[PDB]
Amino acid sequence: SIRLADLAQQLDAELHGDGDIVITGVASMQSAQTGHITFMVNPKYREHLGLCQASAVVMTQDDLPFAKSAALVVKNPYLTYARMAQILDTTPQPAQNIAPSAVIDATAKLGNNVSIGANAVIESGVELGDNVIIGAGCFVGKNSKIGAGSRLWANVTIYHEIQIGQNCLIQSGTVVGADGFGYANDRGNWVKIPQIGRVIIGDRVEIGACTTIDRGALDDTIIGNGVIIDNQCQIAHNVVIGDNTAVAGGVIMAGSLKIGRYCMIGGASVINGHMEICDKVTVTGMGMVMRPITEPGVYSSGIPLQPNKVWRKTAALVMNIDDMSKRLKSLERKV
Amino acid sequence: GSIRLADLAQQLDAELHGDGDIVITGVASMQSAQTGHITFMVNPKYREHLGLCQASAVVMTQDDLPFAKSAALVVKNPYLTYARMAQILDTTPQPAQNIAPSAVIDATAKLGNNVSIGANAVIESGVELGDNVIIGAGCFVGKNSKIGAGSRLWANVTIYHEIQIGQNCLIQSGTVVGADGFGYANDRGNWVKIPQIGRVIIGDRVEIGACTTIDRGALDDTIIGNGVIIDNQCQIAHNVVIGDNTAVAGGVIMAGSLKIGRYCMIGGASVINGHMEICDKVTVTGMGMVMRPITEPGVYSSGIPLQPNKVWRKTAALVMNIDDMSKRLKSLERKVN
Amino acid sequence: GSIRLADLAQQLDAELHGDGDIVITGVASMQSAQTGHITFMVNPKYREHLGLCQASAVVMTQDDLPFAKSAALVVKNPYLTYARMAQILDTTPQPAQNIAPSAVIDATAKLGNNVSIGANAVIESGVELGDNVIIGAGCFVGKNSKIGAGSRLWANVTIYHEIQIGQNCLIQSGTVVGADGFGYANDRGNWVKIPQIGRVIIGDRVEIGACTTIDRGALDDTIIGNGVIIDNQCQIAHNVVIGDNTAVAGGVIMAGSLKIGRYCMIGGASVINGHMEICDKVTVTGMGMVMRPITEPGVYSSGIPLQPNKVWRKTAALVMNIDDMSKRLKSLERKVNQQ
Numbered sequence A: 001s002i003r004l005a006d007l008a009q010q011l012d013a014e015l016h017g018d019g020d021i022v023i024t025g026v027a028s029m030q031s032a033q034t035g036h037i038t039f040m041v042n043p044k045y046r047e048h049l050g051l052c053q054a055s056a057v058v059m060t061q062d063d064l065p066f067a068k069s070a071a072l073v074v075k076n077p078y079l080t081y082a083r084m085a086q087i088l089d090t091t092p093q094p095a096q097n098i099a100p101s102a103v104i105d106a107t108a109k110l111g112n113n114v115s116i117g118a119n120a121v122i123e124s125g126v127e128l129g130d131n132v133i134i135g136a137g138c139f140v141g142k143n144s145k146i147g148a149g150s151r152l153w154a155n156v157t158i159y160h161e162i163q164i165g166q167n168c169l170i171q172s173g174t175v176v177g178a179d180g181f182g183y184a185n186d187r188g189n190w191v192k193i194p195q196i197g198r199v200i201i202g203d204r205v206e207i208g209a210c211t212t213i214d215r216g217a218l219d220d221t222i223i224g225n226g227v228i229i230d231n232q233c234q235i236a237h238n239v240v241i242g243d244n245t246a247v248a249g250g251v252i253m254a255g256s257l258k259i260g261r262y263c264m265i266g267g268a269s270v271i272n273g274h275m276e277i278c279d280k281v282t283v284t285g286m287g288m289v290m291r292p293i294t295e296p297g298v299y300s301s302g303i304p305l306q307p308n309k310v311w312r313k314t315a316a317l318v319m320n321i322d323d324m325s326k327r328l329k330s331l332e333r334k335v
Numbered sequence B: 001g002s003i004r005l006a007d008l009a010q011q012l013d014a015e016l017h018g019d020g021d022i023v024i025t026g027v028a029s030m031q032s033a034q035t036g037h038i039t040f041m042v043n044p045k046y047r048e049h050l051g052l053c054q055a056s057a058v059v060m061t062q063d064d065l066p067f068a069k070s071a072a073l074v075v076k077n078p079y080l081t082y083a084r085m086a087q088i089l090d091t092t093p094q095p096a097q098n099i100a101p102s103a104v105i106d107a108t109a110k111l112g113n114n115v116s117i118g119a120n121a122v123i124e125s126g127v128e129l130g131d132n133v134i135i136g137a138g139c140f141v142g143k144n145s146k147i148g149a150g151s152r153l154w155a156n157v158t159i160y161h162e163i164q165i166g167q168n169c170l171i172q173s174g175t176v177v178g179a180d181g182f183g184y185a186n187d188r189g190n191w192v193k194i195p196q197i198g199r200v201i202i203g204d205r206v207e208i209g210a211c212t213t214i215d216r217g218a219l220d221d222t223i224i225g226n227g228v229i230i231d232n233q234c235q236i237a238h239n240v241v242i243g244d245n246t247a248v249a250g251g252v253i254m255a256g257s258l259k260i261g262r263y264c265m266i267g268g269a270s271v272i273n274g275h276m277e278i279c280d281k282v283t284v285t286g287m288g289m290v291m292r293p294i295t296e297p298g299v300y301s302s303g304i305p306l307q308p309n310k311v312w313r314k315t316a317a318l319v320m321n322i323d324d325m326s327k328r329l330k331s332l333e334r335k336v337n
Numbered sequence C: 001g002s003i004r005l006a007d008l009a010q011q012l013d014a015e016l017h018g019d020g021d022i023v024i025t026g027v028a029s030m031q032s033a034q035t036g037h038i039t040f041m042v043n044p045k046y047r048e049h050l051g052l053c054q055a056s057a058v059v060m061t062q063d064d065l066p067f068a069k070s071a072a073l074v075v076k077n078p079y080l081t082y083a084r085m086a087q088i089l090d091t092t093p094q095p096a097q098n099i100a101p102s103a104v105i106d107a108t109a110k111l112g113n114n115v116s117i118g119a120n121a122v123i124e125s126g127v128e129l130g131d132n133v134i135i136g137a138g139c140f141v142g143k144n145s146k147i148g149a150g151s152r153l154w155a156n157v158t159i160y161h162e163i164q165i166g167q168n169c170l171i172q173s174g175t176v177v178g179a180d181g182f183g184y185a186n187d188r189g190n191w192v193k194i195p196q197i198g199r200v201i202i203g204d205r206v207e208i209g210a211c212t213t214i215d216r217g218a219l220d221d222t223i224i225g226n227g228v229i230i231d232n233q234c235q236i237a238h239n240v241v242i243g244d245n246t247a248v249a250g251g252v253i254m255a256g257s258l259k260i261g262r263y264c265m266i267g268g269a270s271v272i273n274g275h276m277e278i279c280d281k282v283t284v285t286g287m288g289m290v291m292r293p294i295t296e297p298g299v300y301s302s303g304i305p306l307q308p309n310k311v312w313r314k315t316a317a318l319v320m321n322i323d324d325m326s327k328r329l330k331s332l333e334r335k336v337n338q339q
């Protein structure tokens, strides 16, 4: 709980209203009650701010006339919302102190104020930086290193020789460092190629739940600083992802793809390997990426939904489009 | 547990034709059935095949009965009766029995009657587990979460904090409920985390497959209606709402703030955009590319299916250049007219 | 782990050119290799670059040998020799060693010789673990399941009940074998669960990646043949049958009751519908949308690739209206036919 004046100061916002108001938490505009701070970005909500029951509303200067409550004026309400939600965050920590049921190899090196949850398993040679938090049921494999401030939720699996930077966050069920999909072929028989590269994860990386990031075959899979990766993603061996790139849920990336900085990969896209995508590329959802991308911009693929009766005709005509093409050429020749 | 055929027929509301004293030990497919097994016939083309089935009894319709070569249970709906008798004769174990000494249970957790918790499961402060709840081995249930009576988690399920799960739910292994939604503000190209302080509310009789992820809401909640069934490896983003009785097949990806109505059917591997609505009674066939809201009930589809690679090469190239084909068509129309 | 180059050459059946007494300590890429490392060359474009490689030895072909600037192992197939030498020099640790005191093992479980069970793993009643089986930390192995000799599970793998796994398999973390198939009946508008009482049978030498799910069958079994390799995030539905030596790349979804033959290659993110068969020696390229049976071997493909968004918008609009284009083409043909 925090006085509105003090909150406004920490957000570098201009206060319009009683600075003595006590703010206890953040809420959506439709759910906000007395004690809550909320925000608005869409001008459509201006007309009904009189129905919002928040104690304060983060808004722009052009919104201030429509205010029906204390208001904090800022240039970017959504970014200010991110910041105030962090000040008023209620999320608990994955663990506190070291649980007696945790199994920690005696050669593990632990920094100051490391927390390890119940039944977590820490292997030999592991290094955990200051303030690292390991959730219940996690596994951290041999000689892996987790930088200061990084946090793993429950039931995360980190394999051996993995490097994670500072202030990272990994959600439950994620697996970092499994074998890449590497095999030779000896007369129809698959021959396993041991995958003895690593994963290097930079600083301030956030990884979602049930995402898999494979280790490299010889050299490393590399995740840049500030990257965010959603749930159910697959990052194959020797993929390199540049700083501040965002990957939405269910994206599948094949081996040895290189993605630049500040990219945005829409959910359920499929990115083929041994190719590069330059900085500042957006791929919209379900994008089928087969070729390198060398110019920044927005790229898309796929034929959208239709009523089933219509789709049947659309698909049949497309599958026979070579015959249409030939008939068009014949007609041009005749005319 | 074995049961007399007459007693089984009674519990199934079926007309017994044959020896009610036969002892049934389990359910089997028609081709696999042996003595002591009960099976079922849904396809009347197998009528001439019943003499090759070695089951002790067969569920069938009244029209099938003249063709029987075994004791028969006559019902209106053999498939539904099979579902029911397989529940009566189910061999599936429970995820746990009693409370394992290796489980780690906070002193403030509130356990109802007849709760079972498997080895090395971890139960946080404030958790409430209703009567007859079963938590499998290695699960994690986070702070203040509530799981209603009769619900069951298989092994290695993760439930985060402040999650509400209804009665008689079933969650398969590897599933994660309540992780942070994909919420970040952009500050000059750097991502700023938005804490996700909403929850997940799961209704009654919900079934969730393995390695599915259901994220908590940003402020308000992600909501799963009653009777919903969700298959393996689906992604349900923050603040998605799924209406009662909707079925979501395997591998479906949903973006944030999608609302799906009641009684929908979402085919496997579909991809659904966020911040929009799908009305009641919508079916999307598999691999559907759902970009826009769906405002009318019925069946919807997308995608260009497989061809021989040599053929696909031409199809893909021609579609990619379809604007040029369109212009050539227009030009030829003008030249002819 | 270190080995004399001469001894390594013998084990690889390679012709040594250079000092057999060199001590090799590991494998590395050409770019990263240092003293004590062995590397390999598959692309003759790097011949002019070998003076920059600081490996102690390089695996190459006879045609490469005049370009060597180091000890060389000459072979017919550098890529396969690389696979074999990486196994000889593998640094990958085991998922576990010995039986962890924190493991929870039912009294009726049967263990063979030299079994290792990692910390906090849970082994149910009736489970059978063969000789040299390794179960990683945090695994669950359900009632009456059987894991054959030499098979290994990494950490946090879940095996349900009545599952059978053969010899020398390897399963990566987060994978779930034997969950309920997606089976339900309909009672006047309510879903009714169909208990899934079939099993999963996994053959010998199967490798399964991470966070893959393989559901048990409804009555009869889900079957994975010998030598099959399956990547991460795959979904194998109830009653799927996969034939020997087939490869399934990452993120593939297979619907119920699909049968896939032998020596198939299923590209990443493909979607294969059910109640149908794919014959032997079929390749489906990435993101393939498989709606019909495949009865002839060969390569099959689907999907319209990426374009710039403004171009895509026009492509998509024209395709969605292709029925009107077809009607206009037929009308024009009639006019040109003088009808």
Ligand SMILES: CCc1ccc(CNC(=O)CN2C(=O)[C@H]3CCCCN3c3ccc(C(=O)N4CCCC4)cc32)cc1
Pocket: A246, A247, A248, A249, A264, A265, A266, A267, A268, A282, A283, A284, A285, A286, A302, B255, B256, B271, B272, B273, B274, B289, B290, B291
């Ligand atoms: C890195 C984050 C990010 C990358 C790219 C974009 C570009 N915007 C889109 O691609 C919008 N979009 C669609 O048009 C259609 C395409 C056909 C399939 C269904 N559908 C989509 C499915 C999932 C997502 C998705 O993952 N999102 C949307 C909210 C945030 C994540 C988006 C979409 C936006 C955001």
Ligand SMILES: CC1(C)CC(=O)c2c(nc3nn(-c4ccccc4)c(O)c3c2-c2cccs2)C1
Pocket: B247, B248, B249, B250, B265, B266, B267, B268, B269, B283, B284, B285, B286, B287, C182, C183, C184, C185, C253, C254, C255, C256, C271, C272, C273
């Ligand atoms: C719920 C039910 C008892 C009935 C049902 O309708 C259904 C079922 N199983 C499915 N598997 N797949 C699937 C899975 C993987 C890849 C491709 C497809 C579907 O699309 C499925 C559907 C649906 C069809 C159309 C909309 S939902 C079982």
Ligand SMILES: CC1(C)CC(=O)c2c(nc3nn(-c4ccccc4)c(O)c3c2-c2cccs2)C1
Pocket: A181, A182, A183, A184, A252, A253, A254, A255, A270, A271, A272, A273, C247, C249, C250, C265, C266, C267, C268, C269, C283, C284, C285, C286
């Ligand atoms: C099994 C093998 C040793 C050889 C192989 O054939 C193969 C391999 N790795 C792959 N990754 N992806 C992939 C992954 C993610 C997104 C898109 C594509 C494929 O499609 C892959 C394929 C195949 C190509 C065509 C059919 S299978 C390695």
Ligand SMILES: [Mg+2]
Pocket: A250, A268, B251, B269, C251, C269
């Ligand atoms: Mg997918």
Ligand SMILES: [Mg+2]
Pocket: A101, A119, B102, B120, C102, C120
């Ligand atoms: Mg323990």
